[PDB]
């Protein structure tokens, strides 16, 4: 099992650079709007205590340098939605894919196209941690890099990168500018919550093992969902939602192993602790049910 | 600290489907040529024991259906080793600046897995010492390519031909020469004994330090020769002085001498990791090059 990213071409053709004064970052050019972190309107000194509504009333269209490579796109309007700036430009991007904006749930994976100075540099898969951070690989200059899934040539944008936190993990927003997690776009004492294991994905990984004939850990037991959730938390595992149970349905059907039967199996692995699964001693939690199917 | 592939856009616009009869796979369209595995000309029966010069002479241009998202008309064909080259009537307008390179064992590249001419996923792989690669390829992935990108120039280094019985992958360069002792015939084929890419493990241990993980370091040193004795014992590749040189930047950056890191690795091979993990792994990772680490650290 490999972490496979989606082909990045469709997103590559949407990446631009946005500059306010000396502050620069990446933006995303879809039709005639460029989306980017609103913190582009800040000097580094302003970050210590920014008032965005004011910094923005005082900006004008002509203050924003938007560039696709070295070609300037003239801005004809500006607004902010939550923590994202939307710059209306005078050119509709001919390379705009079919797209939507999605707000993903913790556990969901997506591809990150890391970008510097509007120029894509690399692509990799990432999971949204339960504590609403991502364990990304971002260097300074990466703000405005985006995360996405691709579903029949429709690009679902789910993440825009804003910042690195103290412990070296990453935080940002959806494409409506709403942060994942409790973070804010100003310099404070902010820290990631204590993280937990993504139970839904661990179960998907157990289904993957079963599909491949690796099924020693299956037992005769079943559990109630409520009982499972209470025990799981004792081992720093996430409780399951109804949505989780549902996205495990296809793998449940493929293997004929009921979700709550697999939960029983997991509970035992937790209570006794293991002997390998898919030739690994560790339970993997960054492959979703959809990832498992997409690979097998 | 993740495996990071190159952005795949420039390659995506070169992928096409090639079909002969009910045999289909992917092709790479550059200028007015489509490169694909020559085994496209075989039925399953032919593929059991193919005489390719003899099969190819019997084909006409119109036997080849090339599809680019538009049918492209084939106007000429030739074979170069295990790669078929179909000249087509239309030049690919999105051809990047490109080269064909043969990679060295230990080196990494991005794979763009494709099915029916359509890109499906992108990830990094290394060319293993035994000249296989551990890809994520399913049925129909033949003709998917591997590449590196340097300032907009795409260097293609791999074209995918088969999965071996063990679940690893084998293929050719873009000149159609196999990596490893394999052939393009349906017969059971094993690779030689694989070994671990030592220089890469060392690069990855340096990565782990740069990312704030230091539990495996020790105060000890070793000579190159004595390290290599231990490494060969554990089916690791020899570390050369050129490798030590290559590691110079990461050594400079962490203030750990290469031979000091080698002493750490020796202890890891001898003692195991006990309970522990390094950059999330329970296993010593060997598929990041020094260059890959630098490009990210
Ligand atoms: C983003 N492309 C640059 N950057 C920043 N910033 C530098 C800067 C300069 C002027 C004005 C604002 C900024 C932000 C940060 C810092 C940052 C980001 C926020 F959202 C905040 F709310 C904040 F208080 C500070 C940053 O963390 N990174 C970053 C992202 N990912 C990885 C790394 C190593 C660094 C930036 O790139
Ligand atoms: C490739 N897109 C199809 N394929 C093949 N082949 C199926 C087929 C049908 C008719 C004629 C020729 C072929 C080859 C193989 C089999 C194969 C190919 C070789 F070159 C060999 F030397 C060999 F021993 C076997 C194949 O392995 N894969 C493949 C690739 N990667 C992963 C998986 C699961 C399968 C094909 O896709």
Residue numbers in the entry:
A (entry chain B): 3 to 276, 279 to 300
B (entry chain A): 3 to 71, 73 to 300
Task: Give the authors' words.
The SARS-CoV-2 3C-like protease (3CLpro), also known as main protease (Mpro) and nonstructural protein 5 (nsp5), is a promising drug target for COVID-19 therapy. 3CLpro is an essential enzyme for viral growth and is responsible for cleaving polypeptides pp1a/pp1ab. − 3CLpro has a characteristic catalytic dyad consisting of C145–H41, where H41 promotes deprotonation of the C145 thiol to generate a highly nucleophilic thiolate that undergoes proteolytic cleavage. Owing to these features, covalent inhibitors targeting C145 have garnered considerable attention in 3CLpro inhibitor research.
Because the nitrogen atom on triazinandione could not extend further substituents, we designed compound 2, which converted the triazinandione core to pyrimidine-dione, eliciting comparable enzymatic activity (IC50 = 335 nM). However, introducing a cyanomethyl group, known as a reversible covalent-binding warhead, significantly increased the inhibitory activity of compound 4 by more than 200-fold, reaching an IC50 value of 0.760 nM and a SARS-CoV-2 EC50 value of 4.94 nM. The X-ray crystal structure of compound 4 complexed with 3CLpro indicated that the cyanomethyl group formed a covalent bond with catalytic cysteine, similar to other covalent 3CLpro inhibitors. In the case of the compound 4, H41 was placed in its native state, and the benzyl moiety appeared to be slightly oversized and strained. Therefore, we hypothesized that a smaller benzene moiety in the S2 pocket would be more suitable for this chemical series and lead to improved potency. Compound 4 exhibited very high activity but was metabolically labile (only 1% remained after incubation in human liver microsomes (HLM) for 30 min). Therefore, we decided to further optimize compound 4 as a starting point to find a second-generation 3CLpro inhibitor.
